Design a protein around this ligand. Structure first.
Ligand SMILES: *[C@H]1O[C@H](CO)[C@@H](O)[C@H](O)[C@H]1NC(C)=O
Ligand SMILES: *[C@H]1O[C@H](CO)[C@@H](O)[C@H](O)[C@H]1NC(C)=O
Lengths: 218, 506, 211
């Protein structure tokens, strides 16, 4: 029932500015403390700021104190991170997360799903999808999402019908500074030809909505 | 029966019509005058009837500047003179006649007047007033050295009737003045209804009598009760032989000057014994089981004042505000102590608050709505200013349902609400007070009542582990319900005993 | 400013095993330490508060201990779904510092990799580039050597590997090697092969094709 939802993350130009949204649901902020934490795609977690919804107090991490300004709006039931003067070392996944009820602690018991902020002077780029086909017991087929900026990318199979044995591997930063990943699924030989298989790609940074069909070849 | 009198001396207004009218309303149908009888400048065509049933006047009787023919005071027995006119006159009759008119005073129908307990008599400059030189005024006056002055009155008055024996108020045979004083046996200390030693007045007759009893008195030296004169009115509580203590005597009656009554006038209130206008400086009105009565307040009677915020001129207590709280106990509404309030604002010319002026709030015990402190005078590390505050209702809230909100007060160490015991309704918020301690131990299930689930918001104060390390904990004599600060005075409730707010070992 | 030091960085353990993680703080924290579990790409779930208390809806196998400077998480009976990175947190006052984190991963029966090679597409060749892909599927343990062979010749530098995060049901891994080069350098060789070597292998399985 209680859940958070964020948005508004994506590519930004260094020294640019940005406002994240954290839309509350299932409780009243008023009185509750909302915190923001971020995490570099390799490393661990770092606390950023906090905010009581009642009196509107705010603290900040010295790592951020001043460039950033956490706020909210009570009638709307949503928190906000204003991220001014963005450095490349700001590139990380940012989560909002509310504070626990049981005890003077700041244990955070409900968390947003995450929202990604990439901050580099590189340009937004459309992904190339290519079919990896079977034939050449159980057969493997796949998609190849190649050369796109920035992370992240969403690969689904048959609009969500297929989920068993689906592997979408991590992206990898290429020599060219462009990202790539394979997404592969295993299906029974007998099923090929009668079953249609398609991979649904989504790349909101460059507004790409590819649906590529993978069959075997002649 | 009884009704009050005047003090206006010889001042009036322009209208002699009004002078009549206003005179009538006061002395309506009235037996006793509690005060003075001031008949001044009265209309010439008066129909002074209501004056009939007047028996007694506790003060004096002033008759001046009037025009009517006769002064009709037939039931008038006693004038007390317990206050007196000019200085030495229980009766002052001066200048009752007009130049352009024949309207002038001719007779004083005082058939009944028996005595005057204190003060003299001034009967002068009454051009047509008659018979006054015949009356034996030292027979009426009780004071051997009061000023009896009678002259410059009538010129050609008819002789007394033969039945009055040369002492009469008027020509009539029923207008005869009846003698009061025979001088008296040594036993009777000048209080007797006849020469004989056995013929003494009762020990409660103010002046004379016609017999040695309660109800033969011409006037009562203390209180009149249904005819009898008594030193007291029947007490409220009579000793009962069944329960060996006292109980509400149904034959109780209240004093009213000198009259024992069944229930006080439509405007008046009871005070332990007497029927009084307004409660004394240490009582407030209390209506319980069909009777209003003055009850002693003890500390202070609840000086309830206006609060602050919503439904008030001030959004904060400021330096041009704090004075309007002095001696105040209860508070209607709220109390906001905002940043501006304290330091003022030089843009709108409102000065900074003198931190010692805050003490004003030490007299406060209850606040209807919410309390909101968002700033505090640094050199004070606690709200010992509200130490005497006992109850916060929360009947009007602040932000999102907050009946108490303390926030962003750095130098504050303890809270100091030693006497607080009830927050009736609303939410509570005590966050962002970076040196606040002792609050962790407090049991808010005992202060606050109704739900407990999601009413607390206490956070980002000095973490408990620090407070404990620096020794800041609830005095050992406190119960596990916690404390408002350090020491024995600050407990919520005590383990052993409590002597004047301070928890003790014995 | 407070330090949290969390030991060790990563750890392996069999199903059923007991596992013990340690956080050590720079200053006496008495009891104000929170423990979290974070799974690949999800948000971190809270597990323990005040060093030792369970949160509503966490299995009892998870337990926390300690006071002041040394705090401990223990997963008594480790399960496949318990795969995660685990983070201690000081919550005493702000700014809340977290630990480096402890990467947990499960130990399992040694599984052989299923090997698949795909050739490039005709449409990728159109833009002028080639990408062969290899694929090791559902195997254990992690380590596996994906050496390429272009006309029996060993290749170097051109390749790129990408590892799956340990599956949480059968605790297996997966891997995708990519062989990338100019379609000029592609359109001048016949035999492209992927050579995979593992512990669950007796003999390195090779997978090839022709153009
Ligand atoms: C408040 O002022 C009045 C008048 O000076 C005084 O009688 C009273 O004692 C004062 N009360 C307190 C608590 O200081
Ligand atoms: C009050 O004392 C506190 C703590 O020692 C300090 O932070 C603050 O600056 C003091 N206030 C003033 C006005 O000096």
């Amino acid at each position: 029932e209680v859940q958070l939802v964020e948005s508004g993350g994506g590519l930004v130009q260094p020294g640019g500015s940005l406002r994240l949204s954290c839309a509350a649901s299932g409780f009243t902020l008023s009185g509750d403390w909302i915190h923001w934490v971020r995490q570099a795609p390799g490393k661990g977690l770092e606390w950023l700021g906090e905010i009581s919804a009642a009196g509107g107090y705010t603290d900040y991490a010295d790592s951020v104190k001043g460039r950033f300004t956490i706020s909210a709006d009570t009638s709307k039931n949503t928190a906000y991170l204003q991220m001014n003067s963005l450095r490349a070392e700001d590139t990380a996944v940012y989560y909002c997360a509310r504070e626990s009820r049981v005890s003077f602690e700041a244990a955070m018991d409900y968390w947003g799903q995450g929202t990604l902020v990439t901050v580099s002077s590189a340009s937004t780029k459309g992904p190339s999808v290519f079919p990896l086909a079977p034939s050449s017991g159980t057969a493997a087929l796949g998609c190849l999402v190649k050369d796109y900026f920035p992370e992240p990318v969403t690969v689904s199979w048959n609009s969500g019908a297929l989920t068993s044995g689906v592997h979408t591997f991590p992206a990898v930063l290429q020599s060219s500074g462009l990202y790539s990943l394979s997404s592969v699924v295993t299906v029974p030989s007998s099923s090929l030809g009668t079953q249609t298989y398609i991979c649904n790609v989504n790349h909101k940074p460059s507004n790409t909505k590819v649906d590529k069909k993978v069959e075997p070849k002649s | 029966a009884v009704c009050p009198g005047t003090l206006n001396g010889l001042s009036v207004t322009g209208d002699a019509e009004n002078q009549y009218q206003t005179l009538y309303k006061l002395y309506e149908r009235c037996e006793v005058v509690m005060g003075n009888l001031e008949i001044v400048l009265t209309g010439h065509n008066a129909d002074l009837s209501f004056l009939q049933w007047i028996r007694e006047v506790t003060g004096y009787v002033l008759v001046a500047m009037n025009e009517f023919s006769t002064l009709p005071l037939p039931n008038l027995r006693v004038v007390r003179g317990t206050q007196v006119y000019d200085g030495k006159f229980a009766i002052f009759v001066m200048l009752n006649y007009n130049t352009n008119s024949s309207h002038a005073l001719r007779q004083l129908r005082l058939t009944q007047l028996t005595e005057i307990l204190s003060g003299g008599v001034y009967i002068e400059k009454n051009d047509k007033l008659c018979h006054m030189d015949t009356i034996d005024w030292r027979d009426i006056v009780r004071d051997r050295d009061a000023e009896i002055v009678v002259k410059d009155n009538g010129r050609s008055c008819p002789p007394c009737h033969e039945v009055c024996k040369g002492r009469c108020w008027g020509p009539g045979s029923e207008d005869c003045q009846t003698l009061t004083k025979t001088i008296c046996a040594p036993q009777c200390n000048g209080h007797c209804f006849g020469p004989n030693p056995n013929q003494c007045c009762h020990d409660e007759c103010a002046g004379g009598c016609s017999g040695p009893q309660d109800t033969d008195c011409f006037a009562c030296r203390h209180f009149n009760d249904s005819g009898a004169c008594v030193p007291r009115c029947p007490q409220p509580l009579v000793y009962n032989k069944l329960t060996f203590q006292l109980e509400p005597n149904p034959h109780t009656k209240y004093q009213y000057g000198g009259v024992c009554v069944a229930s006080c006038p439509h405007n008046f209130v009871v005070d332990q014994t007497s029927c009084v206008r307004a409660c004394p400086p240490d009582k407030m009105e209390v209506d319980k089981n069909g009777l209003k009565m003055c009850e002693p307040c003890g500390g202070l009677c609840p000086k309830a004042c206006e609060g602050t915020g919503s439904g008030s001129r001030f959004q904060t207590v400021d330096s041009s505000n704090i004075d309007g709280f002095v001696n105040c106990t209860k508070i209607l509404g709220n109390l906001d102590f905002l940043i501006t309030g304290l330091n003022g604002d030089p843009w709108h010319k409102i000065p900074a608050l003198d931190p010692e002026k805050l003490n004003v709030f030490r007299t406060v015990r209850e606040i209807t709505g919410y309390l909101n402190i968002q700033s505090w005078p640094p050199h004070m590390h606690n709200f010992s200013v509200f130490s005497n505050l006992t109850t916060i209702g929360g009947r009007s809230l602040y932000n999102r349902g907050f009946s108490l909100l303390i926030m962003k007060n750095l130098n504050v160490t303890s809270l100091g609400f030693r006497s607080l015991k009830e927050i009736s309704a609303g939410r509570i918020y005590i966050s962002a007070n970076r040196q606040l301690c002792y609050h962790h131990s407090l049991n808010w299930t005992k202060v606050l009542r109704g739900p407990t689930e999601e009413r607390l918001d206490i956070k980002h104060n000095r973490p408990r582990r620090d407070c404990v390390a620096e020794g800041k904990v609830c005095d050992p004599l406190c119960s596990s319900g916690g404390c408002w600060g350090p020491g024995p005075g600050q407990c919520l409730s005590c383990r052993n005993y409590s002597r004047g707010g301070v928890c003790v070992t014995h | 400013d407070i330090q949290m030091t969390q030991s060790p960085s990563s750890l392996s353990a069999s199903v059923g095993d007991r596992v013990t993680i340690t956080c050590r703080a720079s200053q006496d924290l008495a009891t104000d330490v929170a423990w979290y579990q974070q799974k690949p790409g999800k948000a971190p779930k809270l597990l323990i508060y005040s060093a030792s208390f369970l949160y509503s809806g966490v299995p009892s196998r998870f337990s926390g201990s300690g006071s002041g400077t040394d705090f401990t998480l223990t997963i008594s009976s480790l399960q496949p779904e318990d795969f995660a990175t685990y983070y201690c947190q000081q919550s005493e006052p702000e700014p809340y510092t977290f630990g480096q984190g402890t990467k947990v991963e499960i130990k399992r029966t040694v599984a052989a990799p299923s090997v698949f090679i795909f050739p490039p597409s005709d449409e990728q060749l159109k833009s002028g580039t080639a990408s062969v892909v290899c694929l090791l599927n559902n195997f254990y343990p992690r380590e596996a050597k994906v050496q390429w062979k272009v006309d029996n010749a060993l290749q170097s530098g051109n390749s790129q590997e990408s590892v799956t995060e340990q599956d949480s049901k059968d605790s297996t891994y997966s891997l995708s090697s990519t062989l990338t080069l100019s379609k000029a350098d592609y359109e001048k060789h016949k035999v492209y092969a992927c050579e995979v070597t593992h512990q669950g292998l007796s003999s390195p399985v090779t997978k090839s094709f022709n153009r």
